[PDB]
Amino acid sequence: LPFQQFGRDIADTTDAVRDPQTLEILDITPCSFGGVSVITPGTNTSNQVAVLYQGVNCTEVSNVFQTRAGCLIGAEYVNNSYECDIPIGAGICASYQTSQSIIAYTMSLGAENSVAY
Amino acid sequence: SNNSIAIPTNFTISVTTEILPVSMTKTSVDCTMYICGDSTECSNLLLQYGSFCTQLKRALTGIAVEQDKNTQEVFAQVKQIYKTPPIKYFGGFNFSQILPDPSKPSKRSPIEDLLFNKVTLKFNGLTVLPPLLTDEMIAQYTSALLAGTITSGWTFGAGPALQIPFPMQMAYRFNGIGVTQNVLYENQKLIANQFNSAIGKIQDSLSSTPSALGKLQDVVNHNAQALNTLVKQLSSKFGAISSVLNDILSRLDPPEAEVQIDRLITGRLQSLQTYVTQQLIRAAEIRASANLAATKMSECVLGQSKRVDFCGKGYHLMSFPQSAPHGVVFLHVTYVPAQEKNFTTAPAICHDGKAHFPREGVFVSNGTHWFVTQRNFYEPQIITTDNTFVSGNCDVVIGIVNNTVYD
Amino acid sequence: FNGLTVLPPLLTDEMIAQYTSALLAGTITSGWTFGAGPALQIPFPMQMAYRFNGIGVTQNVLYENQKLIANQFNSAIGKIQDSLSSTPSALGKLQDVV
Amino acid sequence: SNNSIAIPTNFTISVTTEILPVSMTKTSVDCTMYICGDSTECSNLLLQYGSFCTQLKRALTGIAVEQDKNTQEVFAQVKQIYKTPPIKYFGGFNFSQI
Amino acid sequence: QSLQTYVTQQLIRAAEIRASANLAATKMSECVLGQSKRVDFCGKGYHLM
Ligand SMILES: *[C@@H]1O[C@H](CO)[C@@H](O)[C@H](O)[C@H]1NC(C)=O
Ligand SMILES: *[C@@H]1O[C@H](CO)[C@@H](O)[C@H](O)[C@H]1NC(C)=O
Ligand SMILES: *[C@@H]1O[C@H](CO)[C@@H](O)[C@H](O)[C@H]1NC(C)=O
Ligand SMILES: *[C@@H]1O[C@H](CO)[C@@H](O)[C@H](O)[C@H]1NC(C)=O
Ligand SMILES: *[C@@H]1O[C@H](CO)[C@@H](O)[C@H](O)[C@H]1NC(C)=O
Ligand SMILES: *[C@@H]1O[C@H](CO)[C@@H](O)[C@H](O)[C@H]1NC(C)=O
Ligand SMILES: *[C@@H]1O[C@H](CO)[C@@H](O)[C@H](O)[C@H]1NC(C)=O
Ligand SMILES: *[C@@H]1O[C@H](CO)[C@@H](O)[C@H](O)[C@H]1NC(C)=O
Ligand SMILES: *[C@@H]1O[C@H](CO)[C@@H](O)[C@H](O)[C@H]1NC(C)=O
Numbered sequence: 019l020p021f022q023q024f025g026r027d028i029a030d031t032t033d034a035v036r037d038p039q040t041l042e043i044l045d046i047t048p049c050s051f052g053g054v055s056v057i058t059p060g061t062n063t064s065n066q067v068a069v070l071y072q073g074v075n076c077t078e079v080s081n082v083f084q085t086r087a088g089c090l091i092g093a094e095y096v097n098n099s100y101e102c103d104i105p106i107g108a109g110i111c112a113s114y115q116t117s118q119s120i121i122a123y124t125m126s127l128g129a130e131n132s133v134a135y
Numbered sequence: 136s137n138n139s140i141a142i143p144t145n146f147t148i149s150v151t152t153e154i155l156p157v158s159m160t161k162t163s164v165d166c167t168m169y170i171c172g173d174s175t176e177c178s179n180l181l182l183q184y185g186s187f188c189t190q191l192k193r194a195l196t197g198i199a200v201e202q203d204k205n206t207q208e209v210f211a212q213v214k215q216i217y218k219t220p221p222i223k224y225f226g227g228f229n230f231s232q233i234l235p236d237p238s239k240p241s242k243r244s245p246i247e248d249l250l251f252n253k254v255t256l257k258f259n260g261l262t263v264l265p266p267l268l269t270d271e272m273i274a275q276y277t278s279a280l281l282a283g284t285i286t287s288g289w290t291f292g293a294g295p296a297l298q299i300p301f302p303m304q305m306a307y308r309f310n311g312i313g314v315t316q317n318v319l320y321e322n323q324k325l326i327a328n329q330f331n332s333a334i335g336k337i338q339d340s341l342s343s344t345p346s347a348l349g350k351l352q353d354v355v356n357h358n359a360q361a362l363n364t365l366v367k368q369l370s371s372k373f374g375a376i377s378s379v380l381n382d383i384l385s386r387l388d389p390p391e392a393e394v395q396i397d398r399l400i401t402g403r404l405q406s407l408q409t410y411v412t413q414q415l416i417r418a419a420e421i422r423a424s425a426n427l428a429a430t431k432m433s434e435c436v437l438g439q440s441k442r443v444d445f446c447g448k449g450y451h452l453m454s455f456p457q458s459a460p461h462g463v464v465f466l467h468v469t470y471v472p473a474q475e476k477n478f479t480t481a482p483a484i485c486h487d488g489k490a491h492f493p494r495e496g497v498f499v500s501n502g503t504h505w506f507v508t509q510r511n512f513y514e515p516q517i518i519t520t521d522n523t524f525v526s527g528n529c530d531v532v533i534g535i536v537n538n539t540v541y542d
Numbered sequence: 543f544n545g546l547t548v549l550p551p552l553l554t555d556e557m558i559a560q561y562t563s564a565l566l567a568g569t570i571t572s573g574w575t576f577g578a579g580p581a582l583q584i585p586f587p588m589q590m591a592y593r594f595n596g597i598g599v600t601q602n603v604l605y606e607n608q609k610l611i612a613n614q615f616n617s618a619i620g621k622i623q624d625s626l627s628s629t630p631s632a633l634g635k636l637q638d639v640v
Numbered sequence: 641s642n643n644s645i646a647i648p649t650n651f652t653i654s655v656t657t658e659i660l661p662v663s664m665t666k667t668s669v670d671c672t673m674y675i676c677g678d679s680t681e682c683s684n685l686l687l688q689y690g691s692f693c694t695q696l697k698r699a700l701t702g703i704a705v706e707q708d709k710n711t712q713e714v715f716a717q718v719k720q721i722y723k724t725p726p727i728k729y730f731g732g733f734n735f736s737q738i
Numbered sequence: 739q740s741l742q743t744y745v746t747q748q749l750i751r752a753a754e755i756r757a758s759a760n761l762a763a764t765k766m767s768e769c770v771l772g773q774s775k776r777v778d779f780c781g782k783g784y785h786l787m
Contacts, residue, residue, distance in 0.1 A: 029257050029366040048258050053163055072163075073262055086265050105203065108265040109272060127275055128216045133286040133296050135220040137729075141575075141582040364691060371690035402689070409695075409742065416749050423757070443772035444717075445764075449578045471579045482588060482605050492601045497588065510592075526602040533587075533608060533731075545673030549666040552708045553715070561715040565770055566738060567722035569787065570730060576718065577771030587731040590786070596773045597784040603651075611653055612732035618655035619737050626657065639661050639755070656781040660762040664755050667748070674741065692742075699745050703752045710759035717766055 050078045052088060057104055059114035068092035068120050070106060083122060085110045090122055099126035137534065140480035142499060143472030144513040146318075148326055150333035151447045152341065153465040154350055155428040157209050159421045160358045160461075161199035161264040162414070166191060168260030169369075170403045174380045177396055187404060191411050198418045203267045205425035209463060210268070210276040212432055217282035217296065225285060226302040227327035232334050233455050233466065235278045243274050243458075246338060246466075250459040253341070253348050256355045259366055273458045280436055280456050292437030305452070311439045312450040312470055313511050330468065337466060351462045357417065365410050373402025428463050432456060435465060450511075472511055481505075481536040483527075484518055490532050491523040491540055498536075505538045517541055662714045666704035671696055 025034030025043075034045050057068035069091045076082050076089040083090045087107020102111035102125040111125040166188035171177030181188070219234060232245050239248060251270075283291040288304040290297035302323060306316040319326060341347060372378050375395040376386065383395045435446035435454035446454055447467025455466040479500040484491040496509045498518070506515030507522050516522065520542045529535060568576040573589040575582035584592075587608055591601040604611060626632055671693030676682030686693075728735070769780035773787065 027257070029363060030370050031257070031259070031366065051165070051168065051258075051260070053165070053262060072264065102267075105267045107267070109267070109269040125272075127211075127272055127279075128214060130218065131215040131296070132218040132220070133282070133291075134298050135225075135286040135300075136583070137585055140584050140588070141580075143580070143582070364695065368690050372688045373690070374688065406690075412746060416753065419753060420756075441775065442768055443574070443577050444767035472575075472582070473580065475580055475582055480585065480588065482585075482591070482601075490602075492605070524600075526600065527606060532605045534585075544677070545670035547668045547670075549668055549704055551663065551666065551711065553711050558711070558715055560721060561718070563723075564718050564721045565766070566735070567724040568718060568720075569770060570724060570735060571722065574772045576720075576722065577767070581720070581722065585731065586733060590731075590733075593773055593786045596775075597786065599651075609732060612734075614653035615655070616734045618653060619734070622655050622657060623737060632657065633659060635659055636661055639664055653786070654781070654783055658765070658781070660765070661755055661758045662762050663759070664751065669741065669744075671741065696741055696745050699749060703748060706752055706756060710756060713763045714759055714766060717763075717771060 050074055057090075057093065057106065057112045057120065059120070063114060064118075066092070066114075066120060068112060068122075072107075085122070093120040093122040096121045096123045099124055101126060138479045138481070140478050140497065140499065141475045142478055142508055142513045143475050143511060145472075145474040146314075146326075146512070147471040147473050148329035148333060148452070149447070149449055149469050149471050150330070150337055151467045151469065152337060152347065153431070153447070153467060154348060154459065154462060155431070155465070156350060156354050156421055156424045156462045157428055158202040158206050158266065158425070158461050159354055159414075159417060161202050161266065162358075162362070163195055163199070163262045163264055164191060164407065165260035165262075166404075166407065169365075169407060170400055172259075172380060174384070176384060176392070177380055177400065180393070180396060180400055184400065184404065187408070191407060194411050194415060198414055199264055201418055201422060205422060206266065206268050206273070208429045209425055209432060210273055210458075212429075212437065213276065213279045213283060213291070215296075216275060216279045217286065217291065219278075219282040219285060226300065226305075227324060228301060229327075229331045229334065230281070230285060232338060233281060233457065235274070241274070242271065242278075244278075246341070246457050246464070247274065247277070247459070249338060249341060250348065250457065250464060253345060254351050254355065254460050256460050257362070257366055259369060261362060261365065270458065270460075277456050277458045280432070284436060284453065284455065289438045292433070308439055308452045309470070311441075312452065313509070314470070315509060315512075315514070318512055318514070333468070334466075348459070351459060354421070354461055361410055361413060365406060368403065368406040371402065372399075374398045375402075431465055432463070435467065476513060481534055483532045483535045484523070484540060485529040485535045485537045486540040488529055489525045490527045490529050490535060491518070491525055494522055494524055496522070505536070663707040663711050666707050668700055668704070669696060 023036045024032060027033045032046055034043050036043055052074040053072040055070040055072060057070060059066070070088050071079050071091075072088040074088050076084045079089050079091070081092065081094045083093065083095050085107055087110065090106065090110075090112075093112050096115075100111075100113060100115075100123060103113035104111060106112050106122065109124050110122055112120055112122050115121050167178055167181060170181055219230075223230070223234070235242050235244055236248075241248065241251075243251065283296060285301065286298060287296040288299050288307070290299070302319065305326070306319045309319050310316060345352075370378050375398045376383055378399075380396065380399065383392050383399075387395065431446065431454070434440045434442070435451065436456050439453070440446045440451045445451075446465075447469040449469035449471040452468045452470050454468065457464040457466065479502070481498045481500070482492075484498060484505065493507050496507045499506050499508045499513075499515060501515075505518055507518050508515050518538065518540050520540060523540060568581060570586065571583055572581035573584050573592065575584070587604065590611070591604045594604045595601060630637075672683055672686070676686055765780065768774045768776070769785065769787075774780045774785045776785075779785070
């Protein structure tokens with residue numbers, strides 16, 4: 019509306035602002051933030067690590083993979099599925115598998131067995 | 136009365152619904168971002184306050200791991216993924232509503248789809264962590280449990296899955312509840328129709344009353360409320376001059392600004408501590424519910440339970456799990472006696488000077504003749520030496536009646 | 543007090559007593575049948591014979607020893623009153639709550 | 641011994657008591673009355689702190705509703721209210737105390 | 739602070755009482771409305787009623 023100058027959401031945080039000089043409604047998005055997790059095999063085994071930026075799209079951030087949990091750097095995606103070793107997020111687990119590197123995969127629920135009814 | 140018994144002459148197959156929460160939303164907090172935002176002056180004092188931030192982070196991480204563990208405890212009981220046979224004929228019993236629907240892109244059963252539709256379930260340092268197991272994986276666990284129950288009965292729970300025709304499984308479940316196999320085999324079509332009608336009514340019953348799913352919704356609502364409250368708590372002044380830290384820093388001198396920043400830090404740290412304690416209590420409640428759900432999955436779905444009212448209302452026959460957003464819905468198929476009839480009963484039959492007691496069942500008189508019947512169903516048979524044991528004399532027993540025992 | 547109020551419970555003691563009486567009457571006259579469906583009346587000695595078969599003991603044991611079992615049950619019920627009356631600590635948990 | 645067994649020749653009917661809490665007193669607290677009494681200045685100062693009083697009210701109301709639900713769950717097993725017959729003869733078993 | 743302490747302690751006690759109430763409901767369903775073969779769940783000995 020003409021008299022309104024700011025905009026607030028249900029959480030009482032500013033979401034839009036009217037530019038004082040030219041009347042234009044500019045939406046405000048909070049600058050990207052997210053937790054950083056270090057996926058590590060035991061330091062007894064290796065010193066290589068992967069880094070998961072949780073909830074951060076891979077644009078904002080030597081293999082880069084985008085999963086629902088966030089952006090994963092340092093783990094290679096493998097199509098084959100194994101039992102979960104290090105949980106990462108929405109169905110993706112990491113493991114240290116043989117060179118010899120850190121792989122990320124969709125975890126396998128179990129062996130498929132069809133009973134002969 | 137001394138001599139009055141009531142024996143059922145029919146049965147009803149009733150399917151009931153039990154909704155149980157399993158997991159709650161996993162949340163993470165950045166203590167510095169919440170309390171101080173981007174202000175370094177606030178961060179320096181927060182460093183002085185102590186190790187409260189690490190304690191809160193550890194508590195929230197433990198809660199998240201606990202939620203994941205609850206989900207695995209409830210759903211990951213099956214060692215192998217079982218698939219229903221391609222030809223879905225199961226003796227006239229119709230599992231289309233509970234079995235996965237390939238046409239649906241989500242690969243979910245109609246009841247699961249309705250549950251997902253019914254319950255549909257700010258950024259100031261607060262993040263929501265996705266669950267380890269996606270809804271598709273929980274659906275696959277549920278489908279595996281259903282396939283194991285349908286094809287193998289309870290054998291897959293206690294060891295290798297063993298094939299069995301579904302009518303035989305129902306007959307053995309009737310034997311479990313105390314009813315002979317002939318009752319199932321003679322009345323197979325009626326029982327199949329009753330089960331089909333009850334399964335059909337389950338969907339309409341769930342759709343009609345949203346409050347049935349309210350528990351799950353309540354869980355979600357609670358989480359939202361908590362998070363919302365926390366965000367609104369940033370608008371509070373907590374005794375300081377203003378909520379915004381930049382305004383305090385610019386308006387006042389540094390030494391005076393220290394006390395205002397300290398008040399804001401104390402208020403926001405107290406708010407975060409209250410939030411963490413509340414979610415610790417809620418996580419304890421959800422863990423209790425998830426343990427109950429795991430026990431039900433082990434006892435109602437993977438076996439037949441003799442515990443009264445643990446698996447539905449009535450005599451438990453079987454159970455079927457269904458996934459729901461942040462919870463599990465158990466469909467309990469139970470046996471309910473119906474159409475009772477009055478009869479005259481006696482403790483023992485006196486013949487040739489000897490008492491006779493029934494091996495199974497009780498003695499029943501239709502006014503002129505005496506029979507032996509099973510307890511939960513009226514199937515009268517002639518009193519014979521095969522279904523009676525003598526064990527005593529005629530004088531001691533109170534209420535004994537004289538009648539013949541054929542051989 | 544000062545803003546501290548105690549809200550009366552929804553169910554009065556009379557109503558809880560009526561629920562207890564209903565459960566007792568059901569378990570006496572119908573056995574366990576009223577829990578799983580329609581209440582099916584059954585003579586109480588026959589119900590106790592059912593329960594004896596449940597614990598692994600035949601019916602003849604009860605029907606031959608009916609008076610002895612009745613006397614034992616009556617004596618035990620009589621002793622329960624004295625045991626509760628003599629020791630207040632038996633109810634301590636409830637008291638502890640308050 | 642690998643050829644010796646012990647079999648009971650008699651029995652005892654034993655009645656034991658188990659006491660279980662079900663509900664606790666339902667309390668409602670007025671945040672303004674407790675913290676500030678009748679003072680308007682204190683109430684205005686308290687409004688700056690935030691929604692603490694609302695959270696307290698929600699928690700206490702949840703506890704009270706939970707107590708009512710506890711009593712309902714424990715004692716409302718049966719839909720019907722069963723009544724014992726006027727003739728109180730149950731095979732020699734005396735239930736007068738219960 | 740006093741009210742927060744009171745409410746937190748009341749919540750914990752409410753959780754404990756809820757656990758006790760669930761146990762009581764389970765006992766009423768199994769000990770009273772049926773015969774229980776679970777050992778020591780319904781008294782000491784072989785449960786009759
Ligand atoms: C990340 O940004 C790209 C931009 O091309 C977009 O396609 C993708 O969906 C985004 N991912 C997430 C998780 O938002
Ligand atoms: C039958 O029931 C009546 C109840 O009025 C009782 O007086 C009588 O003793 C009972 N008969 C026997 C044999 O117990
Ligand atoms: C049991 O009920 C069904 C449903 O009405 C009925 O068709 C059937 O005849 C009944 N059984 C007997 C023995 O009457
Ligand atoms: C029974 O199965 C058919 C498909 O064979 C389906 O169309 C129908 O809805 C099912 N009825 C139920 C589940 O009651
Ligand atoms: C009782 O059963 C017998 C055998 O089935 C039958 O001959 C008799 O007519 C029945 N009496 C009544 C009253 O139904
Ligand atoms: C058979 O039992 C009835 C029931 O009391 C009794 O009246 C009758 O005398 C008994 N017959 C014999 C031969 O004992
Ligand atoms: C019991 O074990 C002893 C060994 O200590 C053996 O000598 C004896 O024969 C066994 N008794 C029976 C009945 O097998
Ligand atoms: C069993 O004990 C009772 C007393 O409780 C006694 O009267 C009866 O004779 C005993 N029976 C045996 C088998 O000794
Ligand atoms: C039951 O016991 C009471 C004493 O506790 C006694 O007064 C009463 O007469 C007994 N019942 C009968 C029917 O004798």
